[PDB]
Design a protein that fits this description.
The structure is cut from a larger assembly and holds 2 copies of chain A (49 residues). Chain A is mostly loops and 49 residues long. Helices cover 0% and strands 0% of the residues of chain A. Chain A has no helix or strand. Chains A, B: This is Major capsid protein. Chains A, B: It comes from Human herpesvirus 2.
């Protein structure tokens, strides 16, 4: 004969999200979103100095 | 002849009535009225985390 009641003096924090960019490690890279990356073959970055 | 034994004072201490939400250790927990826990042996608190 089970009975329930919900406790409200306080509430539960189910999940916390980390954003990365919000981090400070985000400096060390230039993050860009290249959705076609699934379709690529080779990316080349060429440098002249 | 006049002699008298005197009562020179009466002192009482006032018992200090303190409630529980004064204390610093109310930070440490959540207090909620839950009558009927005399009735119930089993307990579970489930929060979906």
């Amino acid at each position: 004969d089970v009975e329930f009641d919900a406790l409200l003096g306080s509430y539960c924090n189910t999940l916390s999200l980390v954003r990365f960019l919000e981090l400070g490690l985000s400096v060390a890279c230039v993050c860009t979103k290249f959705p076609e990356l699934a379709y690529m073959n080779e990316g080349r970055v060429q440098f002249e100095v």
